[PDB]
Curated annotation (Swiss-Prot):
Pathological condition linked to this protein in its record: A chromosomal aberration involving ALK is found in a form of non-Hodgkin lymphoma. Translocation t(2;5)(p23;q35) with NPM1. The resulting chimeric NPM1-ALK protein homodimerize and the kinase becomes constitutively activated. The constitutively active fusion proteins are responsible for 5-10% of non-Hodgkin lymphomas.
Tissue: Expressed in brain and CNS. Also expressed in the small intestine and testis, but not in normal lymphoid cells.
Record organism: Homo sapiens
Protein's job: Neuronal receptor tyrosine kinase that is essentially and transiently expressed in specific regions of the central and peripheral nervous systems and plays an important role in the genesis and differentiation of the nervous system. Also acts as a key thinness protein involved in the resistance to weight gain: in hypothalamic neurons, controls energy expenditure acting as a negative regulator of white adipose tissue lipolysis and sympathetic tone to fine-tune energy homeostasis.
Active site positions: 152
Coiled-coil segments on the chain, per record: none
Name of the protein in its database record: ALK tyrosine kinase receptor
Residues of the whole record sequence present: 1093 to 1400 of 1620
């Protein structure tokens, strides 16, 4: 089996908790992707509710190895703000990875669906946004401290435990990091698939990735959060953004975005990586924003 190393420990398939296929029931599809399905499931021998990620049976050996590595990567993290791997069912087909069920869904969809609307809702506030930001920043700090570069921080890759009050946001997708870990580069993708709009100059120009490249991405995620799920650089294509960003162009504040929050974004988007804050500092700054009554009492725009 292909190995995986994290935080000074090497692991393989045999260290994943295999759960008997007989113990797993699929309840409903949760909006499948183009490669692999995701289901709400239940594990019961007081049953454990889970997300079930599947591997298409029609796939290459490379795809299978990639699937195994995703399981390994996620299983070796230990943090509140990173989705848990409950186990795997690799000894039957189709292969399954069992994940913490994130009933609030992905953060981009959540923001879009829950953004104040001139009708029945308007139950989301600045504090909810700051809490999601802090949650993900905590996860990012953990990755930074463990020398793990995510490479693809973006709202689509963050998940919510539930839609209501008490939601916790967590990093839930590690496909890019997995791809680079296995191949050393984006072998499966190409220019059109790269998350250009989330990448700093040294990443898209030189292919240099560090924790400061996650800092930049996190700045874009912050804009996604505070814009309530808008696509970054809304009027621009990937190449236009590449040109815009390299020449010093940055996004304007999202509508109604408090100054102190936008300032965090602009700090994350410093041209020179050494000038960008690490995640400890980002966390401190988010927490300070959360302390400011003028920040948290700011109304979100109604569509």
């Amino acid at each position: 089996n292909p190995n995986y190393c994290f935080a000074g420990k090497t692991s393989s398939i045999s260290d994943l908790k295999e759960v008997p296929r007989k113990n797993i029931t699929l309840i409903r599809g949760l909006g499948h992707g183009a490669f692999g399905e995701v289901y709400e499931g239940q594990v019961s021998g007081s049953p454990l509710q889970v997300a079930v990620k599947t591997l298409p049976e029609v796939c290459s050996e490379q795809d299978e190895l990639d699937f195994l590595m995703e399981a390994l990567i996620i299983s070796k993290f230990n943090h509140q703000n990173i989705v848990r791997c409950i186990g795997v069912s690799l000894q039957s087909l189709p292969r399954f990875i069992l994940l913490e069920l994130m009933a609030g869904g992905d953060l981009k969809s959540f923001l879009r669906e829950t953004r104040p609307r001139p009708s029945q809702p308007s139950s989301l506030a600045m504090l909810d946004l700051l809490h999601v930001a802090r949650d993900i920043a905590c996860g990012c700090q953990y990755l930074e401290e463990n020398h793990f570069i995510h490479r693809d921080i973006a709202a689509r890759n963050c998940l919510l435990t539930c839609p209501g009050p008490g939601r916790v946001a967590k990093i839930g997708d590690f496909g890019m990091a997995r791809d680079i870990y296995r191949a050393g580069y984006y072998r499966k993708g190409g220019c059109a698939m790269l998350p250009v709009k989330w990448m700093p100059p040294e990443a898209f120009m030189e292919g240099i990735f560090t924790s400061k490249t996650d800092t930049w991405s996190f700045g874009v995620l912050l804009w996604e959060i505070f814009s309530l799920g808008y696509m970054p650089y809304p009027s621009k294509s990937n190449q236009e953004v590449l040109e815009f960003v390299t020449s010093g162009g940055r996004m304007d504040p999202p509508k109604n975005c408090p100054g102190p929050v936008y300032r965090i974004m602009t700090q994350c988007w410093q041209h020179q990586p050494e000038d960008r804050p690490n995640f400890a500092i980002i966390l401190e700054r988010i927490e300070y924003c959360t302390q400011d009554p003028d920040v948290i009492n700011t109304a979100l725009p109604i569509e």
